[PDB]
């Protein structure tokens, strides 16, 4: 359940994560090569998202995203180790 | 044109008094594929096959 207050609380954390993405230099450079390789597609945009848009996310946007994307055909559950198959 | 000379006493690379535009003004990208600007001669599939042959046999 995605409450508005929880999204408001997590906005700061998400923004801080986006800003701190530069700590992992290799990861930020991988995001940069993705951006430069695909300029005419949203696939080039950074995974952490556009900073100025992070504060624009609402509960409804998250709910719509999860409803329209987390579908049965998209779920793969893999198990390994000491697990009983049946 | 910007203003007075500022010496090295200002530690920050970007002085505070400069203006930074908001996110509204910056233009957004058009993240869609656009029609190719190609002439009649090169649009012919035979010419494309000739280009590929030249690329992968002599070039």
């Amino acid at each position: 359940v995605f409450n508005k207050q929880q999204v408001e609380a997590e906005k700061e954390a998400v923004y801080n994560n986006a800003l701190s993405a530069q700590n992992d230099q290799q990861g930020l450079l991988l995001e940069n090569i993705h951006f430069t390789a695909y300029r005419d597609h949203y696939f080039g945009q950074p995974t952490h998202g556009i900073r100025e848009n992070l504060h624009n996310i609402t509960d409804e946007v998250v709910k719509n995203f999860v409803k329209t994307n987390y579908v049965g055909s998209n779920f793969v559950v893999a198990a390994a180790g000491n697990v009983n198959s049946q | 044109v910007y203003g007075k000379l500022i010496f090295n006493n200002i530690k920050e690379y970007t002085p505070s008094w400069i203006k930074t535009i908001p996110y509204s003004q910056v233009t957004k990208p058009i993240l869609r594929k656009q029609p190719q600007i190609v002439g009649k001669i090169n649009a012919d599939p035979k010419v494309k096959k000739f280009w590929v042959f030249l690329r992968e046999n002599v070039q």
């Binding site: 945009q45 998202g49 556009i50 | 535009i21 233009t27 002439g39 009649k40």
Partner: peptide, 30 residues
């Protein structure tokens, strides 16, 4: 056609023969 490029390009909005923006533009990389 071969000469159609000149005819089509004649209809362009350019400042004194130079294709420039009509207002300030700023681009940022996310």
């Amino acid at each position: 056609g071969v000469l159609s490029e000149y005819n089509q390009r004649l209809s362009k909005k350019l400042h004194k023969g130079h294709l420039v923006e009509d207002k300030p533009t700023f681009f940022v990389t996310s």
